[PDB]
């Protein structure tokens, strides 16, 4: 099992995008996904002010700058991987479709409709 970094594509896809402190970061995760089988790791990041959200074209936003220095601490709770595919498999970071980030929290829930009427045989008569 090998891990490899992302394939090409736009910045929003090939990097780890997130919003923290009010600014939009695009970090290079090739330092995390570079191994066969299994101090600190420093990931360099780029920052943008002009943001095209989701996959839409036509509605851009400008992110006002934030004064002072930004520091964020967060939990990585999971990964989105895509398999590149005969004795080995390569996994690469994937993403870009936001539904995958909600599917991971809503996986336990189901919506059902209640149907309160029913009939059954009984031994009685009006």
């Amino acid at each position: 099992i090998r891990f490899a970094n992302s394939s090409g594509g736009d910045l929003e896809v090939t990097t780890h995008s997130f919003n923290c402190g009010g600014e939009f970061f695009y970090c290079n995760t090739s330092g995390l996904f570079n191994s066969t089988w299994i101090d600190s790791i420093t990931l360099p990041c780029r920052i943008k002010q002009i943001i095209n959200m989701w996959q839409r074209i036509g509605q851009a936003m400008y992110a006002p700058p934030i004064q002072g220095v930004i520091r964020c601490v967060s939990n990585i709770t999971g990964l989105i991987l895509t398999r590149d595919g005969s004795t080995t498999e390569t996994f690469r970071p994937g993403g870009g479709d936001m539904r995958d980030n909600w599917r991971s929290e809503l996986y336990k829930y189901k919506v059902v409709k209640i149907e309160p009427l029913g009939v059954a045989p009984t031994r009685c008569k009006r």
Partner: peptide, 10 residues
């Protein structure tokens, strides 16, 4: 017992 399917969850 109930059947769930996270990939078809609206």
């Amino acid at each position: 017992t109930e059947e769930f399917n996270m990939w078809k969850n609206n």
